């Protein structure tokens, strides 16, 4: 039999091409490998994590190297407002001379790509000023990548493999990760800001060669050890400070100004220094909570066992959950993806409205790409969070050990949960779509005053509570007599209120009826996607149509045409259907973010306010209007620098449409077609001398759903990425 | 005639009459009270 795959004898004995495809697709499902034990499972995962870490630091090293080698960082730092950053050089032998000239720009030697990832603003903010600064960082991270790779090898060796119990010491790992991984890293990052980043923003060079002889503050550590910590907040950078120079600069290293630096339109460095110092203290303290070898602290099992409501409303409460969580990796992975997935959305939300990197706001293409980038990644992570929660129920859930606790009771009323999610999705869809169609008919008939425009009073009321005085609610921070206004009036409100009432920045943009409709469409996306994913998990173990679904696994094709038909009945298929709704939801979010910002960046916000209340406005004034430059990247008269995005735009449409083939036409058609191809090859003279070793067959039922979904997603992403960058960059960049 | 009235009681026939009635009522109301947006 064939060697590959070495981890499954069932695959290795398959004489068809399914062996190749399935061998690739089951490589990282360690639990399903032949001869796998629990202890070997954890040691492989530990080794794999070292590999991922080494790739991350190597990928970062490659970015640093190419910007220094081929970028214009040293030129960009001089005039960041009027210089486009360079990502890397182009050496494409297929280029013609017009293409070579078209992509030559920014004073570069030859063709180059413009960066959109914002690394220039990030690196410039944290104190990098020269190409040699980037070169040393690149070599340092390449070395760090090597060390992690060695550690991955080291801990696979006979005397360094941790035992199974080592991976299940929950109290000790939480203490270290909270205090050391989070707390000390944040404390160390405060050291960089106080010692390097802040001085570099004030025109003083601090490097490894002189940082031991430079005083971060004129009073060196006397305020710190004497408790007079307020001395570090005196004489902050003035409003006239020019970033990177000593004119208008101050001396404070810890402040709470609370606003935006007037020139860079980004958060103050002294606030970001005090921010990281504050959480570092909290995280170091929080890391002394759990039991270890020293006789103090909590044991997490005791905490869970205690929290049972005395009235029996939650049944057994949280009894038995410690083993349920501590023994299942899919439960832990589901909690990790759900938490990280939400934080990825939070990063996108807060970075566009509280830009932390100098000159990030004015780079419109970078801001658009960064928000879209992280929202699409958050969407994928959330779908994975529910997928592994569904896998937990099939593989790791033990009904006997979870008898009567909160987890078991979720399955008890799963129909109630699914029924109510179904109602909310239907309600939002009916009325959200209905109002849009009503407004479209009114616009078509020429009566824009007959449409249903509902003021977002609840959201506009929140903005009033934060100090936005436009709506006249005179509430909390919007009223100058409230205690909330008075108490903070000496710490951060003067800066915060100044920024929130500036209508040229993205801090709490003004909202109207156009924002009301879009937000309710977003809710429909979240609820429907949750409905599909939640049903896939709660029904994973069985249903009326298939009472014993657990016996078949997480992913199987179907149960056949009997009992009416069971296509797409597994929990794997519920995730597969939910990915479509995730893309649809994130699409609505990113269209909404992009259109509301393009109108702001052009100064004509009225277009969004007027055209966003009906769906023809989106198609006409957003998709059609902003495609004009994209599709002219190359035309019968020539081409320009946008021809790559024009080409990638159609490239996306093609991959997307190809995915329809794997989703619409199913296996039986193709297997019978391949059988005539097998006949044709064998009877053809001069070709039947050559022969195959793996019998050709059609893709499997499950494989084609993944292959179709992969093409659908890739085409989805590449089409909008090309349009997002091209429309934003051509308009302003 | 009993069978014919039974045929008129079938679901498709009832729905056609019911929605024809329901639609007619709404159309007639908007004919005499054009452009209703607020109860007032």
């Amino acid at each position: 039999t064939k060697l590959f795959p070495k981890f499954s004898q069932g695959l290795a004995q398959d004489p068809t091409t399914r062996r190749i495809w399935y061998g690739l697709a089951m490589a990282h499902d360690f639990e399903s490998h032949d001869g796998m034990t629990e202890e070997n499972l954890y040691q492989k995962i530990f080794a794999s994590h070292f590999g991922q870490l080494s790739i991350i630091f190597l990928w970062t090293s490659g970015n640093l190297f190419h910007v220094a080698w081929q970028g214009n960082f040293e030129q960009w730092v001089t005039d960041p407002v009027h210089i486009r950053p360079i990502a890397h050089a182009i050496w494409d032998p297929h280029f013609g001379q017009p293409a070579v000239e078209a992509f030559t720009r920014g004073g570069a030697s030859g063709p180059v790509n413009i960066s959109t990832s914002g690394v220039y603003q990030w690196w410039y903010t944290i104190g990098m000023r020269t190409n040699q600064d980037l070169y040393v960082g690149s070599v340092f991270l390449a070395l760090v990548s090597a060390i992690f790779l060695f550690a991955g090898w080291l801990h696979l060796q006979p005397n360094f493999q941790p035992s199974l119990s080592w991976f299940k010491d929950a109290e000790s790992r939480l203490n270290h990760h909270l205090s050391g991984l989070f707390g000390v890293s944040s404390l160390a990052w405060t050291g960089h800001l106080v010692h390097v980043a802040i001085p570099e923003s004030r025109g003083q060079h601090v490097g490894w060669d002189n940082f031991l002889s430079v005083l971060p503050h004129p009073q060196g550590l006397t305020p710190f050890f004497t408790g007079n910590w307020a001395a570090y907040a005196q004489s902050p950078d003035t409003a006239s400070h020019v970033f990177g120079t000593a004119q208008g600069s101050g001396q404070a290293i810890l402040t709470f100004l609370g606003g935006f630096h007037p020139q860079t339109q980004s958060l103050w460095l002294t606030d970001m220094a005090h921010h990281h110092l504050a959480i570092a203290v909290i995280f170091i303290v929080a890391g002394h909570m759990y039991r270890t070898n020293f006789g103090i602290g909590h044991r997490m099992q005791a905490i869970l066992e205690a929290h049972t409501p005395p009235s029996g409303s939650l049944g057994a409460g949280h009894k038995g959950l410690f083993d349920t969580v501590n023994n299942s990796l899919h439960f832990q992975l589901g909690l990790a993806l759900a938490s990280v997935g939400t934080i990825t959305s939070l990063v996108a939300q807060h970075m566009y409205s509280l830009p932390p990197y100098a000159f990030q706001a004015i780079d419109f293409t970078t801001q658009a790409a960064l928000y879209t980038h992280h929202q699409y990644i958050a969407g994928f992570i959330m779908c994975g969070a529910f997928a592994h929660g569904a896998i937990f129920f099939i593989r790791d859930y033990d009904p006997e050990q979870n008898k009567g606790n909160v987890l078991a009771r979720m399955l008890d009323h799963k129909e109630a949960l699914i029924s109510h999610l179904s109602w909310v999705s239907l309600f939002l869809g009916f009325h959200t779509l209905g109002l849009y169609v009503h407004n479209d008919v009114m616009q078509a008939f020429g009566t824009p005053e007959k449409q249903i425009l509902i003021e977002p009073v609840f959201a506009q009321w929140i903005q009033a509570a934060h100090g936005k005085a436009l709506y006249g609610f005179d509430f909390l921070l919007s009223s100058k007599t409230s205690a909330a206004f008075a108490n903070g009036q000496s710490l951060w409100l003067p800066g915060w209120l100044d920024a929130i009432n500036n209508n040229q920045n993205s801090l709490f943009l003004t909202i109207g009826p156009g924002d009301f409709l879009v937000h309710h469409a977003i809710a429909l996306g979240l609820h429907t996607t949750t409905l599909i994913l939640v049903k896939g998990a709660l029904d994973a173990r069985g249903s009326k149509l298939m009472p014993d679904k657990k016996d078949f696994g997480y992913s199987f094709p179907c149960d056949g045409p009997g009992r009416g038909g069971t296509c797409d009945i597994s929990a794997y298929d519920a995730f597969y259907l939910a990915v479509f709704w995730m893309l649809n939801t994130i699409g609505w979010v990113t269209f909404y973010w992009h259109w509301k910002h393009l109108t702001l960046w052009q100064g004509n916000v009225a277009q969004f306010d007027e055209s966003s209340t009906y769906l023809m406005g989106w198609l006409r004034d957003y998709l059609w209007l902003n495609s004009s430059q994209l599709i002219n990247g190359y035309n019968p008269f020539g081409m320009n620098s946008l021809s790559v995005w024009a080409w990638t735009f159609l490239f996306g449409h093609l991959i997307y449409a190809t995915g329809f083939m794997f989703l619409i036409s199913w296996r039986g058609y193709w297997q019978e077609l391949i059988e005539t191809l097998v006949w044709a090859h064998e009877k053809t003279p001069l070709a039947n001398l050559v022969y195959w070793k793996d019998k050709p067959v059609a893709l499997s039922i499950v494989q084609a759903r993944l292959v179709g979904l992969a093409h659908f997603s890739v085409g989805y992403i590449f089409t909008y990425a090309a349009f997002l960058i091209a429309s934003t960059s051509g308009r302003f960049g | 005639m009993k069978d014919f009235t039974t045929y008129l009681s079938t679901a498709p026939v009832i729905a056609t009459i019911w929605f024809t009635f329901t639609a007619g009522l709404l159309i007639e109301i908007n004919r005499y009270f054009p452009d209703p947006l607020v109860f007032s």
Partner: protein, 150 residues
């Protein structure tokens, strides 16, 4: 295949045959851009679909505004059909089980047991909506265009 046939006819006629006769000569609706532009996929996207769809998307507020509405509605029906084509009745029968439970809880469950469509009916419902949406989209786009300029 027929969509390309009627796009070929529409662009070729406007570019090379249809037009207004004047003293100097014949000026065509699209000015003879078929020969140089229809040899790339980008040419069809820009010169045919994007440029000529200007009439349909600007129809609101005029007598042709109906074609604008059907242009959007056709786009909707087409995308709606992909729900039936990309899914299978196994998911939907389980979904109806939870929905039926809510009706049973309220003593309002029907006597005719709800069932998800059969496998074949899902494919038939999918293709019928796919065709109606796609064909109606071209229908609105053609008439609003040719009536406006032709």
């Amino acid at each position: 295949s027929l969509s390309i046939v009627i796009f070929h006819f529409s662009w070729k006629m406007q570019s090379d045959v249809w037009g207004t006769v004047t003293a100097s000569g014949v000026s065509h609706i699209t000015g003879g851009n078929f020969a140089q532009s229809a040899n790339t996929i980008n040419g069809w996207l820009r010169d045919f679909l994007w440029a000529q769809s200007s009439q349909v998307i600007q129809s609101y507020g005029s007598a042709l505004s109906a074609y604008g509405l059907i242009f959007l509605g056709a786009h909707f029906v087409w995308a709606f059909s992909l729900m039936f084509l990309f899914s299978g009745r196994g998911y939907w029968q389980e979904l109806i089980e939870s929905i039926v439970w809510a009706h049973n809880k309220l003593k309002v469950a029907p006597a005719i047991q709800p069932r998800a469509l059969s496998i074949t009916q899902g494919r038939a419902v999918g293709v019928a909506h796919y065709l109606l949406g796609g064909i109606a989209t071209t229908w609105s786009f053609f008439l609003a265009r040719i009536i406006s300029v032709g």
